[PDB]
Each structure stands twice: as structure tokens, then as C-alpha cells.
């Protein structure tokens, strides 16, 4: 499984009076038809830097693993929410596994805290809430071979298809000052 | 304009056993564009240190994905020049040229010297990096403009070298953390 993420890192510093509600969308451009359902993986959501792999000297690195396959990430696959390698079904209109032209809205509310999703503008009935966190969250997607997706982070270069829920800010605005917005892709060698 | 790639191989000094202090990999250039006037190209390969990561709140540190040699924590070669701190140092080699299709660049990191040196199509590049501080962990890295296609040859089954590493050098592939899978990360402007 491959993974992609932008360089957008969201957290709370107590007393900083930060913006705490963040929104982005993912558009699915292509999935592979001629592959089996067990060989297909497409999940989108959020992950925490607390899930990084440790290195000598206190270093920590993103592992690029499947969204929801650990205790520090939270994914949606169209039918299910994933966390801790466990899937749970959630309802949405016309619910289906993620496919070409789906637009997934991803919501992170660090004041709750909560994570929720929309599919093609419509609420997904089921959320993650009151999870403990100790790190920074980033948008993330994981996918099997040949799948093509794009982050829509807001603004001229990734316009949202849907209006964010009240109180939510566009993820592109959270880039660190002086850094350029970039997308990182991880794949097995 | 410029993208960057790296494997998850991190090389550094420790107080433990250190049979291998000299590390080697190759980069194969699969495609560069022939000469065109409407665009300038960029292709640099070498090494970077985690000390060049960008700091984030809470002590986080992230790879910036910037051009190799565009800061004081990375060390790049482009066929004609070595780059560090955004400055180019002219070096020489036989049959000299900016990197092009089918070039194989050897990259060498010697943590005992310390030094970073290069070969091009098997021949030594005359001019190396030597009088640098080498704090942090080093990783192979490449930076390139759009449409350029390159591959790391790190050693191991999936990336055999075209040339023998110089005496005393070990393949980067051997330094993967034992619980990690070998992956390549690609950074691109959004």
C-alpha cells in the first residue's frame, strides 16, 4: 500500500487560542477495475505524528502505512471507519466503497476532539470522538496500486467542491509560515 | 518546480559496533529531456542530514523536500558542480556533462573521514566535500525538475549496483531498520 499526505500539521498548544476545526477534501480520480476486492485498498482520513517510527537519537519518521492500521490514524473507505486495524460500518446515502469521482470531506475538530466525514457532500453517520492525542495530525490517504487521488486543500490550487461545515477552516491555510505546500508520496521500493 | 525523492535509509555515527562506516548507492537516470529553450532543468543527487529538517510545534521535525545542496545540510552533484549552501563548486570528470539519460551516479559517504564523494559512469569525480560538520543522520536524496525519471539502486535484490563499491564501502540497503520496510518517498509542490 502506498500513501500520500500534504505538509499540513494540526495540533493544540494549550493557551495559543488556535483555530481547532479543519477541513479538506479528497477526490478519487481513478481506481483499478481488473483487480480483486481483497487486493483493493483506498482509505482517507487523518494520522498523528505519534504514530511515527522511532530512530536513533530521538528521530521520528512517517511510516507511510495504511490509514487506520494503527492506533494513531483514522480512515474512511466508503463503507467503514478504520482505526486500530478494525473496521466498523457507517451509513451514508447510496453507501459504496470509494470509487472514481467520489469526493470525501474530512473534518478534524481538535476542540471536541472529533473526526468525521462526508461523502459527495452528504453526512457519514459515524465519527471518532474523545480520542486522546499527543502529536500533530495531518491529512493522509492510503491506496493500492494504480489508484489516483488528489487532495483538495482549498484555495485556487485545490478548490473544495462543498462548503465546509460551520466553524471549519481550509487546511491549505495551516501551512507553516515560509514553507511551500507540498504533497509527499510513499511507496515500497 | 523541483521534486525530491529519498529512501528510508538513515546513516549515522554511534558508540556501538561499526564494521561499516562508508556507505554507497547509485542513481540511474532513466530519462531527461533533450535540449529545449523554453525551460531550464534541474537534476542533483547526493545526501542530506536530518539536521536540515523543518521544526514544528511540540518538537516535530519534517523533511523539507528541497533541492539537494540548497541549504547547509545537504550535498549534491549535478555532473558539473557540487552544491551546498546554494553555492556551486566546479568539479571535473572524464566525458563531463550535466546528468543525462542512462548516466549512473555513484554516491559515497565516509563517516570516518568525513567526506562525500561521487563517481559518474564508474569514473571518479575530482572534487569532494570534506570540511563539513556531519551532525545528524544522512539519507540518500535526489532532486529534479518535472518529467525527469530517476531510480535509486541501493543494493539488495531490487536494486543491484552497476559498479563495484570502492574498497571498504557497504551498500545503503543494509542499513534499513530491521522492523521497517524499504520505501521511497517523493515530494512534489502542490
Residue numbers in the entry:
A (entry chain B): 652 to 840
B (entry chain A): 651 to 840
Manuscript text:
Its gating properties are modulated by numerous accessory proteins, such as the 12.6-kDa FK506-binding protein (FKBP12.6). The binding site of FKBP12.6 is formed by the handle, SPRY1 and SPRY3 domains.
We solved the crystal structure of the RyR2 SPRY1 domain with the variant I784F at 1.45 Å resolution. There are two molecules in the asymmetric unit. We chose chain B for the structural analysis because the mutation site in chain A is closed to a crystal contact. The overall structure of I784F is similar to that of the wild type, consisting of two antiparallel β-sheets, a lid region, a β-hairpin finger and three 310 helices. In addition, the two flexible loops with no visible electron density in the WT, including in the FKBP-interacting loop, have clear density in the mutant structure. While the root mean-squared deviation (RMSD) between the WT and I784F structures is only 0.34 Å over 177 Cα atoms, I784F clearly changes the conformation of the loop where the mutation is located. The mutation site faces a hydrophobic pocket formed by loop 663, loop 764 and loop 784. I784F is close to one loop linking the SPRY1 and Repeat12 domains and another loop from the SPRY3 domain, suggesting that the conformational change caused by the mutation might impact these inter-domain interactions and in turn affect channel gating.
